[PDB]
Design a protein around this ligand. Sequence first.
Ligand SMILES: NC(=O)[C@H]1CN(C(=O)CSCCC(=O)O)c2ccccc2O1
Ligand SMILES: NC(=O)[C@H]1CN(C(=O)CSCCC(=O)O)c2ccccc2O1
Ligand SMILES: NC(=O)[C@H]1CN(C(=O)CSCCC(=O)O)c2ccccc2O1
Ligand SMILES: [Ca+2]
Lengths: 257, 256, 257
Amino acid sequence: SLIDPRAIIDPSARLAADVQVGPWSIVGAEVEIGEGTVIGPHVVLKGPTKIGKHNRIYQFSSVGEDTPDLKYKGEPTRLVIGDHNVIREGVTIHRGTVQDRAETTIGDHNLIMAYAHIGHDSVIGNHCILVNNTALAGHVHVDDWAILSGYTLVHQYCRIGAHSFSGMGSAIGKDVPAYVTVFGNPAEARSMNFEGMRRRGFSSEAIHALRRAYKVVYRQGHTVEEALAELAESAAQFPEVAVFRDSIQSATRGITR
Amino acid sequence: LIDPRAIIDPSARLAADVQVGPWSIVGAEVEIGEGTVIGPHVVLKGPTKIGKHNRIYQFSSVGEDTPDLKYKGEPTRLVIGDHNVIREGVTIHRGTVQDRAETTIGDHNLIMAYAHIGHDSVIGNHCILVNNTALAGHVHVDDWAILSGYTLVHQYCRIGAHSFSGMGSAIGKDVPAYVTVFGNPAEARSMNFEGMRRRGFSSEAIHALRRAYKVVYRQGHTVEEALAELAESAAQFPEVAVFRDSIQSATRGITR
Amino acid sequence: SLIDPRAIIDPSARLAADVQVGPWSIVGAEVEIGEGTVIGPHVVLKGPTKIGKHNRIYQFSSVGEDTPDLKYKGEPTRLVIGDHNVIREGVTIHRGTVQDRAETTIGDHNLIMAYAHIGHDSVIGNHCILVNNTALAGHVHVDDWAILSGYTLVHQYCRIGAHSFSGMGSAIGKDVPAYVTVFGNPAEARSMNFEGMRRRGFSSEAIHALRRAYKVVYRQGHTVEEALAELAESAAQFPEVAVFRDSIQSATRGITR
Ligand SMILES: NC(=O)[C@H]1CN(C(=O)CSCCC(=O)O)c2ccccc2O1
Ligand SMILES: NC(=O)[C@H]1CN(C(=O)CSCCC(=O)O)c2ccccc2O1
Ligand SMILES: NC(=O)[C@H]1CN(C(=O)CSCCC(=O)O)c2ccccc2O1
Ligand SMILES: [Ca+2]
């Protein structure tokens, strides 16, 4: 059928009628798979885990394993994956811990390339790209349209802002505000992702307002609280600047400079 | 020879000699040449041609579509030559129509565990890609180059013949032939004198290349002035011609 | 003791009581597996290799392969793994070479996370943590209670001292003394793993003697020789300082500064 007979499907697994599963893949207990999803060959799915519609998961991926994190001690934690995601070769995704929200969450239209790691309790939004070997250490929040280039390392609890960009081999120990571009080990704030803003149809007015907001946070010698007070006027006028100001206000590990 | 637990597509073409391990998939339009050993748990996808006396290790994906968004299903190709070793979990992607629609690997290359050969990359002969080396795409690696563990190469970069990268090198610009580079970002340190000894280079050639490095890196010349100074040495020693041509064809700039 | 019939067990392999082997795993010739070891699915074991008791080995791991450069050709060479080790998704562990130890050795209670690499002739002690994609290039010694954060790179012949710590994406080219914390590419010494000493129940006076032993080596412009002769007395008092002194005395290839 669409389920390869060489696949192991746990009787407790729930598959929508058109789900494809390849040879030598394991669909574990308490795994749910939504309509149109294709599971390649040599995939291990472990639950409790929910996968949505029209997803593609590639060979040698381990989706829904326990974190090796020594704070995890066997409790019933979840992984939720949305719709229209692509999960490439050798990707590892772990379920959450009771210490946080007992859930790891991915939304829709994400591209997660080969040997990427999505650590316990991470939250990925929609339309994100994680290039080869991007490692999210745990409790990492990645907001919509962020792009992490190959071998980007993200420390535990870091927030990656909407429409942000990391250069290849970036080592992120602090939060990346929305729209900010970071490079290097350790990661350094260069500019804003003006290329991504134009690709996603931002107004000229919003881009100019974001250009000015960067300057207020990074280039006028303000403390963060001083910069947040200076951003208030622009943030009230433009939602993009409010997105920026909020990423800064909610950046619990401080911002990448 | 072909394990009964392997899946061979009807449209694949295997030379008589070829071994395929259990639980390996040999997909549509994959050709595998005589003496080649496909390990267990290998995924091959085409259109792909693999030459003679290759060895591909468990959990490799060789000939997959690039996930690069600019790829759209075109029947792009991967060509691998002879006598290559492809170790555990290596990813090799076919080309894109935007470039020349082909990822190309030559002969006698060693590609160690979890290395990545991005779409449209061109590898020559006798190269070593150490563990987790990543060719981002459209990367040209000339003969005898050695990239140490976790070397990242930016799209379109050229790695010169007998060049060498230290472990964790991040290469954003062309590496000239023989040049040894280290760090993130990568910087030129010296020449691969050991690679030269390994090839039985004459003391004369080794001497002239030591001079040539100084001309380019240590004597304050622009690249133009450097090329002019190298012309006589380039004419006398083919070994220096290689160095000189690698700088000539680096329209991007050279790793400093 | 569930041996999945879909695994290939070599007639020369030896399985102790309560060994589990998941489906589509290979236990090669001259592989020995000790009591209660769990081998997951899609595992490749090559010998000659001896694995002890109550280990866990995850899917896609290659344990006991040969080093890839054909210039190390030579047999037999060995891999020894002790007890209570956890080896996660897609770990590579290579046997030794006749040109050196002829053995790769791992002790007990080690955590080796996804896609870590243990190079030929490496020696790992007890209670070590190697985080995602840590690579020991070859002939690397990791002493007890060391932690290597994700994507730590270790050069051939380097020693990682007892209770030492490396920040994520460290490139270690020189010996890391016992207790010392290192960060960056290339790796630099920042401090000592005090947080680690405390949670191992080190006496406060021992911790203070190590705070002094650090300053005596790194921050007082002493030679190595000078530094050692000054710590003779403290090293006679505190076994802990002796462990620090010994890690420096036995680094003729220089220490990470
Ligand atoms: N989608 C792709 O083509 C590539 C690009 N890439 C990147 O990190 C983006 S290229 C950035 C480096 C530059 O400036 O060339 C990448 C890096 C490492 C492995 C696979 C990859 O996939
Ligand atoms: N806990 C995990 O599973 C994480 C933590 N981590 C780190 O680099 C730091 S963990 C410091 C060692 C200690 O656990 O005490 C990490 C980084 C990059 C990828 C995966 C990772 O796995
Ligand atoms: N021959 C092998 O099997 C090794 C060598 N190697 C290298 O990066 C080259 S040696 C690093 C340089 C120095 O130790 O000083 C390496 C590095 C990281 C992972 C696996 C590796 O495989
Ligand atoms: Ca700045």
